[PDB]
């Protein structure tokens, strides 16, 4: 009697030099975790109670007034949406995405207008009612712009944090959305997927803040938005309308819960301090390497993260599919590939899976 | 410690209706926690991993694909979405609107159930579908659905739950196979909580969907199982609207993991044990009690016993009976531990 | 004015395809229809984002198989010859961003469809006027710059700027070094790092006597960029000057 495990399918594991990403299975858990979705596996509870006491729980990890689990940030999107359009109306909830009678206009910068794995944030405006209204450019966004945009069909305004994958360039800041929000009596939605930050975001003012589980806090697949508590109970309205196929399971949950509760014991100056070391000598032991050239590199964005970038002269582009096809497979970040440029990522890199990338690298140069 | 239910003040209940959705669903074997503790541990190719899922429920099912999903909610959205907008990834991101493809969805009038409180039209809708109920609760007549199919027509929808909608002199499944293959128009089923892992495929449907936590013994997941073409279509909606609805790597491990114990248990030593074990409780338990069968004719047996269902609920281990018209109530099984058993003799004789 | 609005002045309508962050070649390849008139290409890695987006030559390959033409935006670009050999039918250069022209510039590519461009001067073109003196201006900036290999630009450039880095770096508090262009072209400039506001440092650099506007693309870094493309040699002692005279 073996229990079902990876090898049985025929999937190998695979080594993620490129951070917690959703199609390499977001995060691996710690045994704390992993316990603590075992415990919630052995008893049944009123899942109403849960998603209060849960709430109060993430709210004062954040400090905000409540907050609303969820399965990730994409569906904390369309669920933050519909909770601005449709509110705690149980008929309104049950007749979304048809906004009916209620105003359904969500502004947001044209730099800001990404994609969740493919799913547009549009689409996710779509889902909760909304209309998505892309105000200025790529390249620029005036904040005059954004406030002539805001009518009495507005329902929210959306920003998203992501230097990665939004762009901010001559756009408009959070804490000047939050103004013009403030100005029209008009919500503002924050995507903070990948944030590290937990009190941050709320403090700007912002009405509802989305955070993923496996990106940084180490969470199973899961979420949460938090934020103004009438608009928190707004998103647990939505369960009973569009959010109820975005199912949250007990054990996802407690697992969030357990994730939290670590990710706040550990300083980010002694989480900051341990990876600059750990790249440090990692870099220099891939610096040795003959035809590459590596060094430590913070991040471009500005972020307390650490990283090895790769420099090759000898294909960086062909060394990244050579280095997904050993057999470790090993998923650098090929964000700098038109630069001759790779990266190693430490966020999901295990000691044993540092030792996988510069064996799989001395075996192919 | 680590975290559980005590430090969250949220106290364990006692399911005696079966494996609802507001009490968390179903609780997990040793096996199960142990499959979803092993995914935990490493990354993988998720595509890899839904095409081996895939393969593992397609031969549980006896059908040609299968594609994981949250629940029966997710995978009534997302086979009204394969098939409206097939795997094309421009319709795919455009949707809930459908632009010129077909996306009526035809369903008997009987079978338009909710989702706990979410109803099945909006699941339809989350797809880009547009619900066409034909005929009355009461009576939908062949010719009619027959008749609903047009150029417009996207799919049809059929509801196997007896326990949520209504057959009565409605279109049975074999008839609106029947109708589907006329047309060329795939035929959607919907069984969430069904025990038949096999019959609802072999009638020719072209998608079925269940519900992981309400029979299966898995955990927030489920499974759309069907024709090849159409499962492709449901897992390219997952750069769509089904992107939102995600499936975790331990919770789809659980769920293969409760598939394979699910089915090395005979069907026959299910009920033998359920009925020996509910006709013992029904000795035990004033009050008018006794053991009855599905009334819609499952191999699942109960006990049949207002104010009470309140003060059940209140105790210091809150029972869940069953409320499924007044005149009696009904003692569910299939979540009942051996110390909910107990408990529920123990906080009846008061 | 977004390139929308271009689009609008022109007849036409604009249909965004994908996201900031991501765009398949699939999802631009579905959008065209017997109701698309061009497909839209920019090359700046300034202004636009190429993150896992469609490259030219596979825009070049969809346009080829639709039968609709592809426009490539390459305003600053230094290559005159490598976007018109993609394939792309049409090509827009702006005079005065490196061609050292006078305000003015030029569509090139397929005889046919720049014959097109031409009948527009009686049409929607016709306020957007190009004097003779301009256009003269041009052919002789063209004629200058094809004279200089960009071999000969960037090497002189570079010692320049390296030149340039080292007095800057002397100065108390700021640290500079030369930097090559981030979006990879043959382009160098000097890197200041500010640690003692690189914000503030940017607006008292433009409110001097004389003012010096530095490039504060990097001001969330907290840092700034001393570009020579337009700096004289004259500008650059300006630099230190007012560099020195505030710290």
Redesign the interface.
């Known amino acids: 009697?073996h229990?079902?495990?990876?090898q049985h399918?025929?999937?190998?594991?695979?080594?993620?030099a490129q951070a917690n990403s959703?199609?390499?299975?977001?995060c691996?858990?710690s045994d704390?975790?992993?316990?603590?979705?075992?415990?919630?596996?052995?008893?049944?509870?009123?899942?109403?109670?849960?998603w209060q006491?849960?709430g109060s729980?993430l709210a004062e990890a954040t400090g905000s007034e409540d907050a609303c689990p969820v399965?990730?940030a994409?569906?904390g999107?369309?669920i933050a949406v519909a909770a601005c359009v449709a509110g705690t109306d149980?008929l309104r909830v049950?007749?979304?995405?048809?906004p009916g009678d209620q105003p359904n206009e969500i502004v947001l910068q044209?730099?800001?207008?990404?994609?969740?794995?493919?799913?547009?944030?549009a689409?996710?405006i779509?889902?909760g009612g909304g209309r998505a209204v892309e105000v200025?450019?790529?390249?620029e966004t005036p904040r005059s712009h954004v406030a002539s945009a805001v009518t009495r069909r507005t329902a929210a305004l959306v920003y998203v944090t992501s230097?990665?994958?939004?762009?901010?360039?001559k756009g408009v800041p959070l804490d000047e959305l939050v103004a013009i929000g403030r100005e029209h009596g008009v919500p503002v939605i924050v995507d903070a997927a990948g944030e590290g930050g937990l009190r941050r975001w709320v403090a700007s003012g912002a009405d509802l803040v989305i955070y993923s589980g496996p990106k940084m806090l180490g969470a199973?697949?899961?979420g949460f938005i938090c934020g103004r508590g009438d608009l928190v109970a707004a998103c647990r309205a939505q369960?009973?309308?569009?959010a109820?196929?975005?199912?949250?399971?007990?054990?996802?949950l407690?697992?969030l819960?357990?994730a939290v509760?670590e990710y706040t014991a550990v300083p980010e100056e002694q989480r900051a301090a341990e990876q600059l070391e750990r790249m440090t000598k990692l870099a220099a032991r891939l610096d040795k390497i003959p035809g590459l050239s590596a060094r430590t590199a913070q991040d471009?964005?500005?972020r307390t993260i650490y990283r090895v970038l790769l420099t090759v002269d000898p294909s960086a582009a062909t060394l990244a599919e050579e280095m997904r096809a050993g057999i470790p497979?090993i998923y650098l970040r090929d964000?700098k590939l038109?630069?001759?440029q790779l990266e190693v990522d430490p966020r999901?890199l295990s000691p044993d899976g540092e030792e996988s990338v510069v064996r799989r690298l001395e075996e192919l140069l």
């Open positions: 009697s229990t079902m495990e990876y399918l025929g999937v190998v594991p695979v080594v993620s959703t199609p390499l299975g977001g691996t858990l704390g975790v992993i316990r603590a979705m075992g415990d919630a596996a052995r008893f049944h509870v009123d899942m109403e109670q849960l006491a849960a729980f399965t990730g994409a569906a999107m369309a149980g049950q007749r979304l995405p048809d044209k730099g800001h207008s990404i994609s969740y794995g493919g799913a547009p944030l689409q996710m779509a889902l200025g450019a790529v390249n230097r990665t994958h939004a762009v901010h360039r199973p697949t899961s369960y009973s309308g569009i109820r196929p975005m199912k949250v399971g007990k054990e996802n407690l697992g819960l357990q509760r471009d964005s500005g497979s964000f038109h630069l001759g999901a």
